[PDB]
From a paper:
FGAR-AT encoded by the purL gene is a multidomain bi-functional enzyme that catalyzes the fourth step of the purine biosynthesis pathway. The FGAR-AT protein from Salmonella typhimurium (StPurL) has 1295 amino acid residues and is a single chain protein with three major domains. The C-terminal glutaminase domain produces an ammonia molecule that is consumed at the coupled active site present in the formylglycinamidine ribonucleotide (FGAM) synthetase domain where nitrogen is incorporated into an FGAR molecule converting it into FGAM. While the FGAM synthetase domain and glutaminase domain carry out the two enzymatic reactions within this bi-functional enzyme, the function of the N-terminal domain is not clearly understood.
The native crystals of StPurL protein were exposed to xenon gas and it was noticed that crystals derivatized for 5 min or longer at 40 bar, diffracted worse than 4.0 Å resolution. Moreover, solving the structure of StPurL protein crystals (StPurL-Xenon complex) which were pressurized for 4 min did not show any increase in the number of xenon atoms bound as compared to the crystals derivatized for 1 min therefore, 1 min pressurization of xenon was used for further studies. Data sets of the xenon bound structure of StPurL were collected and refined using both native and a mutant version of StPurL R1263A. This mutant was analyzed and was found to be structurally identical to the xenon data set of the native protein (2.65 Å) and diffracted to a higher resolution of 2.18 Å and therefore, used for further analysis. There were no significant changes in the structure on introduction of xenon and the StPurL-Xenon complex was found to be isomorphous to the native structure. However, X-ray crystallographic studies revealed that none of the three internal xenon atoms were trapped in either of the proposed ammonia channels within the protein instead they were bound to select hydrophobic spaces within.
Residue numbers in the entry: -7 to 447, 467 to 1295
Amino acid sequence: GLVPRGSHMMEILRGSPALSAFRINKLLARFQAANLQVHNIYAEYVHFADLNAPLNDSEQAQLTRLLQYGPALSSHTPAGKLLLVTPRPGTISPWSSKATDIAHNCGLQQVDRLERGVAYYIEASTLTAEQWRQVAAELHDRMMETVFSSLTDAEKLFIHHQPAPVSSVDLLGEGRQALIDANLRLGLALAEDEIDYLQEAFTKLGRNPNDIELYMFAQANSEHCRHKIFNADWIIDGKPQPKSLFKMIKNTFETTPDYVLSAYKDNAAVMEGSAVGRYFADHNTGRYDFHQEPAHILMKVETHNHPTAISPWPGAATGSGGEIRDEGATGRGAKPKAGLVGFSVSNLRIPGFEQPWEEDFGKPERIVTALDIMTEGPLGGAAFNNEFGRPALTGYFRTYEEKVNSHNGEELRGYHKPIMLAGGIGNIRADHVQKGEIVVGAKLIVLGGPAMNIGFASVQRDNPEMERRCQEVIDRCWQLGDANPILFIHDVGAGGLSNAMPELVSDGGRGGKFELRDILSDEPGMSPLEIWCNESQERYVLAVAADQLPLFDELCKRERAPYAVIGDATEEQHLSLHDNHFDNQPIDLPLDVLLGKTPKMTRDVQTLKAKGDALNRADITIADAVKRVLHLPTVAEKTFLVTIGDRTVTGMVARDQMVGPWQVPVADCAVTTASLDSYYGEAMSIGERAPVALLDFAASARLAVGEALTNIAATQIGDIKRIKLSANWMAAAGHPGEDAGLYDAVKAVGEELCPQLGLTIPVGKDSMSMKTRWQEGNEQREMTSPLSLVISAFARVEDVRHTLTPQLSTEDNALLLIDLGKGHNALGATALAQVYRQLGDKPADVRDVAQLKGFYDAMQALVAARKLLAWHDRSDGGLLVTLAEMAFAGHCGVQVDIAALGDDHLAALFNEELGGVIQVRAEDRDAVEALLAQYGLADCVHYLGQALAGDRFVITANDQTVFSESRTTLRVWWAETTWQMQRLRDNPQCADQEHEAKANDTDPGLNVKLSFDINEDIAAPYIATGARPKVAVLREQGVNSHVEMAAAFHRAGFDAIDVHMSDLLGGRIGLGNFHALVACGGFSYGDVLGAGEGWAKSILFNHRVRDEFETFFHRPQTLALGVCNGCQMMSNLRELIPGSELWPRFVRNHSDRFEARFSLVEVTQSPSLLLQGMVGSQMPIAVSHGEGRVEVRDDAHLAALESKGLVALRYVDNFGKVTETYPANPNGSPNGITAVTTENGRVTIMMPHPERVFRTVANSWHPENWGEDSPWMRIFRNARKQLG
Ligand SMILES: Nc1ncnc2c1ncn2[C@@H]1O[C@H](COP(=O)(O)OP(=O)(O)O)[C@@H](O)[C@H]1O
Ligand SMILES: [Mg+2]
Ligand SMILES: [Mg+2]
Ligand SMILES: [Mg+2]
Ligand SMILES: [Mg+2]
Ligand SMILES: [Mn+2]
Ligand SMILES: [Xe]
Ligand SMILES: [Xe]
Ligand SMILES: [Xe]
Ligand SMILES: [Xe]
């Protein structure tokens, strides 16, 4: 299929069927519902290659082959009306970026660009032209895609427009009116004083401004970029105030500077970490080693609220993507470690599952629903974290939408504009914490992706693999230590380059001169304004000395990170942009003019305070309340948000959300090890309580801080002054009451509580227009957010191993409540009130700052001394939920008495005051109570009773039974929300299976059987000789699990060498010098054209590297391992490997969802040399994949594979049987297959990651008796011994 396209040819190639049966049934169903009478629906990927030159037979076959991928779904002969869905013309999909990379790396330079569409074939035959538009509408996303009638209509996707010229705004010719006209025409959003400043500046300069200069200025003076509210002067109830919001936040550093290395000066904050073994490959040798040095800790938290409202997937993806850039661009280069994720939305209103507090209040047409946000956003955030390679380990998710009598009377409050929140921690070297000086003549570089027309203007675009490559360069740069060439670095975000690059020279006291046509652009029609000010993703800006440029270029080429030198730093503090194409100068400005400031804002405002009403209990019974609270999404099980995101990459994850044998997602905070050779680490927690702010601003803010503290407290940290906070403020500024509440709330934490507790807030952010207006009848409606403080806490951890969870034990035990509420038992703005459509009266609050600190200190004392069996704090859903979730995590019963807690049982069970339940050994109860009394806690400590074996959740009040149910019943109710979300988002069959397994109380949870001694280092005689065989640790662009793979081979006595595919293509390395090869995990080319395919095919279609791999595998004494992406790649090179004739392929999981699980496997009999001695063993292992379903050609292949004895690992359920039920088997592989070997055992591929869990501390659940090494260490030691 080959056609003309301007001065290019366009090829059209068939692809594979695009829809699984269940996806088809969903479409047919939606069609029946909208009363469209569609008889049948079929879809098929189709691919469009824009060629700059012709392809020969050989190359034509190669391209065709590249585009045969995916599940082998049942194919069909097209019938009915064709509707072709493609990206919007003038847009380039991420798929296209990555697939085009692969063509290039397979030596197909003739391919200018590849793009994909989906051809739908609809048989209805009944429909009107209007109804076909309704069909067309179901089949695509209005914001990213369009629908065409013809395969040849795709030629619009590749039109090249002539570069548009710069456009001047005629101030000198029209006066002020021209600036007014441009302010509306270009949507610049300028204030009148901003327009005056510009009129004057350009009038002084004596010439007309260019559109680009105005646009740059407007986006730098947005509330988003300038933060005027946060620096404003205040008058509140007629009294001027001495400090701005920012000043009140800095107060916390002024009063608590301890441990902080950088604050308010950079893209992230930095605090002291620990001296540990930092593991990476030297520039010199390419050998990986430990570098004993300080690994200091950075932190940042960002939001992406507006874009998530319009296009939730890319909005959430880029929210995280931008924040990862911030982290990497801290100092002179740093390394992201773990992530966090947050969502706030209006009511879900799940079809079929509507809850008694949900009311449809309508919404704007321009925005998506709450349910669409929670279906697509989390997938997008996960897309970035998974494809980039950072584990997501903590998060919140709240739903709120209600008509409530709050500070400005009866109003709608909620999150029609949602919160989407992404943050993380990273590590940084001491000597890179400070930004270097920008030397005059410094080259100014853009690192990363090409410019496209992105910042419809709120629909973002993510390419995480691009950012990954960029990060490898940054890692190459900090790993050079004091030879790091990065003088200064900054992320590119709002305002794109028009903000980032003046920001950069300015921070350095320099100017720059720039050349527009040096910037990498994929859209040649862009105006200069568009090149300079677009908000395209995956870009950094930096300065490097001219003489380091040859180093920076070797680094980038080898990682295949694109970059451009676009200008020079000048002594003179001027900004210039030249254009070689139009031989002119779009920007010619002094910086003090460009960055000059209009007067600061003054806000002169007044307090509103809701009275709010006492809770009406007419319809409330304790039993009906328990059922309702557990069906509040805020309370309810969060699995749909957790298993979609990787939790194990880096091999440093110690505590993830999943807890215990039953992997229940209730961990109160995240923890990571500092290195792969220490038990020191880092921790993260979140606290958050917005609804309280509808009654009381300050209390909500204090509660957010306190809850972060209670969520982190059972971690071994020590001094509270180690705990550092991000404060992210969401508000409806201007909405009556909100501004005074904002001031009061910032003061409450900045001026008071945080200083009193010794808590620093060294980073933060604000998002100041959390409101939505639209027309419903011909009446206007507003949905206004509560003031929403989200606190994230971060800390150096002293000992990762001493972390407690909510997992109860049934040994002889005592359950003690710490009620920091002190009997107040407030019910206002609780889960309980919400769920009976009320706000209620008095909310919770920090009641006693000294006791709050006493609590933290006591907990630390008990954690260090090992005096606790379990911990869970009280938050949403109260003590009731706290106890229920512990019982869930411990798979046991609870027997408690709440008589000492008041006569008001409702209020005792459902208040959301601070505190928690501790479990201790019965024999320690007195000593623990005595210690808590020593820190002043006596009167709020209450003995409750005990955890017991069994399924009874029982609550008494001396002789009366308050509440009594099956723990399992409660646990299933608590799961219904995630079940319903999984059911409508994923393969329903899988969601139901997962849900239904939870109802079987007999589930023994994860358990282990070992055929060998986990502590016996069978490699030690060999290590002891000092002879260290090399292992080729092989990575392709996009690979992300290589450091921990290398660390595992290293512990077994290997010299791990960093072999990038570019090293093999450039002849710098040759497999002929190795006896051992490992292909690592990740998302090479973002899995595009099928996970592992581009990697493998770039090997195959380069005949010289192809031969290198064939020769290796054909030698008699070589060994190879392929894990995950590497398992996939190797399965796609089968032709090079002897004894692999029967091997399967690996394709989309049956669930149709990325599965990040801790899965139980067994070791099966096979020739596998790496699995020697382990056969019969049953242990859990890290699973992180979207495309691991084993697929065979037919039953004959499967039988043949099986009878040859090549299957090496299988998934089993917790009862220990081979299973295809989900998630025990996360991907749907036949016979539970997840590893296979060759006839001679010398090559083995597996989908799970043993390299992520070779340390016991990096197993989510593990038996108490295991030492440093897990069972999976034996794989690597088997390799060592086998080489001999
Ligand atoms: N949006 C999210 N993404 C990832 N994990 C989340 C998210 N929301 C909640 N979680 C995780 O689910 C578990 C339960 O969350 P939640 O009940 O909100 O925690 P808590 O009540 O302790 O503040 C926690 O381990 C939390 O980190
Ligand atoms: Mg100190
Ligand atoms: Mg909770
Ligand atoms: Mg908690
Ligand atoms: Mg919380
Ligand atoms: Mn009191
Ligand atoms: Xe300007
Ligand atoms: Xe962490
Ligand atoms: Xe104790
Ligand atoms: Xe290996």
